[PDB]
A paper describes a structure:
The [name] Pentamer, composed of gH, gL, UL128, UL130, and UL131A, enhances entry into epithelial, endothelial, and myeloid cells by interacting with the cell surface receptor neuropilin 2 (NRP2). The other critical tropism-determining complex is the [name] Pentamer, which is composed of glycoproteins UL128, UL130, and UL131A and the same gH and gL proteins that comprise the bulk of the [name] Trimer. This elongated heteropentamer mediates tropism for endothelial and epithelial cells by binding to neuropilin 2 (NRP2) and triggering the viral fusion protein, gB, to facilitate entry into host cells. [name]-directed antibodies isolated from asymptomatic donors predominantly target the Pentamer, suggesting that Pentamer-specific antibodies may restrict viral dissemination, making Pentamer a target for the development of vaccines and immunotherapeutics.
Residue numbers in the entry:
A (entry chain B): 1 to 213
B (entry chain A): 2 to 52, 52A, 52B, 52C, 53 to 82, 82A, 82B, 82C, ...
């Protein structure tokens, strides 16, 4: 019933930079606005209430201003720990209504990932299934490529990748990729390799191992 | 002031489920308590409010969930309930309990803001069945050793529904741990990995237990990841 327009949807800044986010209301809500910060996987946190009032415990760099139908939330010196999705909430009338949210990410110095390979444990092998895991650790930016090769035969259909949110300390990323074979298809082949492409590597890197070792 | 949530998990479409929240550190009676839901990869939507003992109609709901959801309180135990009757596919989300304004708060009659939220509870609407996970050590080796570090982890496989919680050494190892999001496999079961990179010199002295919790199936496994012998 009261629409909330939040902009931007997504923002990237460096450490120390000023980030601004605005919120638009369909009708005037006076000062009945709150701002929350949702770090991924956690619960939301109250940041600002009464449009401009800073809640105890929050760093003095956060600051909300505005009234009526136009509000803002500045973050003056962006810190790596300030990565989250930010939401405005309207408290003037029922239904309580939120903004669409704004995602805040860092921009950092390009970092190349560490590549680690994990063969199947004999535990998973007695059950009849084989899973080889490749891990990419602490890289930036987020784009990366992982190619599985079994006996130098590239693979599709038997693999699934997963990526993390940015770190709240070093603003980097991590990625696991899992290759799932059967104990039969696995024991047929010899060399299992993982070819990682990133822009922090002038050359693709390939971690291999031989089955049974 | 705290809020702890519980319940949830899987629920057949058209079924029922009760989600709860426990509050401590405050006079539960004197506060309004709302329910908010977040669809996966989406924003928050308000589900409803339970009023603070000065009301005779003690509840307000959003029109979208108004005919299927009932919000209630325990007679005396400081609990908040959210019973999702005749659930639909669009009701799969994380349900958060939050605390609203105090009965002396002038704004609270028509609306209000929150200050404390719960951790959330995942409500998955599906007609699959619960499966406990399998926990496999990803042992540290020369393949997982870089310079001055080794990476070891856990592979939690073939479980449903979501979520799964992974911790290392009862929560005391929080440096370098990377818990990955879960991927929905072809079978309809999820898999997630938990890795932690540690110093190589501690691998023969330090003990590494990953803790895996799957509350929907009531499965907990505390796995010893160990350097292979070879």
């Amino acid at each position: 019933d009261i629409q909330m327009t939040q902009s931007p949807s997504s923002v990237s800044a460096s450490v120390g930079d000023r980030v601004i986010i605005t919120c638009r209301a369909s009708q005037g809500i006076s000062s009945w606005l709150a701002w929350y910060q949702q770090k991924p996987g956690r619960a939301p946190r109250l940041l600002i209430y009464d449009a401009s009032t800073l809640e105890s415990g929050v760093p003095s760099r956060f600051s909300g201003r505005g009234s009526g139908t136009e509000f803002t939330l500045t973050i003056n010196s962006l810190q790596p720990e300030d990565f989250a999705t930010y939401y405005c909430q309207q408290g003037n009338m029922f239904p309580l209504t939120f903004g669409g949210g704004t995602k805040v990410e860092i921009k950092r110095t390009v970092a190349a990932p560490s590549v680690f390979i994990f063969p199947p444990s004999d535990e998973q092998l007695k059950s009849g299934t084989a899973s080889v895991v490749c891990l990419l650790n602490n890289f930036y930016p987020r784009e990366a490529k992982v190619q599985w090769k079994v006996d130098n035969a590239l693979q599709s259909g038997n693999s699934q990748e997963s990526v993390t949110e940015q770190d709240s300390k070093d603003s980097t990323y991590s990625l696991s990729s899992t290759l799932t074979l059967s104990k039969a298809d696995y024991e047929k082949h010899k060399v299992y390799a993982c070819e990682v492409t990133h822009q922090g590597l002038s050359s693709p890197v390939t971690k291999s191992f031989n089955r049974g070792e | 002031v705290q809020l702890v949530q519980s319940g949830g998990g899987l629920v057949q479409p058209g079924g029922s489920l009760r989600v709860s929240c426990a509050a401590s550190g405050f006079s539960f009676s004197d506060h309004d308590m709302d329910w908010v839901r977040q669809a996966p990869g989406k924003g928050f939507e308000w589900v409803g409010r339970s009023r603070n003992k000065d009301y005779s109609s003690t509840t307000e709901y959003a029109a979208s969930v108004r005919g299927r959801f009932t919000i209630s309180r325990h007679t005396s135990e400081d609990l908040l309930y959210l019973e999702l009757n005749t659930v639909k596919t669009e009701d799969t989300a994380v349900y958060f309990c939050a605390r609203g304004p105090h009965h002396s708060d002038r704004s609270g009659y028509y609306g209000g803001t929150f200050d404390i939220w719960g951790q959330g509870t995942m409500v998955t609407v599906s007609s699959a069945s619960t499966k406990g996970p399998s926990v496999f050590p990803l042992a540290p080796s020369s393949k997982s050793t870089s310079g001055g570090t080794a990476a070891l982890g856990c592979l939690v496989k073939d479980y449903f529904p979501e979520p799964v919680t992974v911790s290392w050494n009862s929560g005391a190892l929080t440096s370098g741990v990377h818990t990955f999001p879960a991927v929905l496999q072809s079978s309809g079961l999820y898999s997630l990995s938990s890795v932690v990179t540690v110093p190589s010199s501690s691998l023969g002295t330090q003990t590494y237990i990953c803790n895996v919790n799957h509350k929907p199936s009531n499965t907990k496994v505390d796995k010893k990841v160990e350097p292979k012998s070879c």
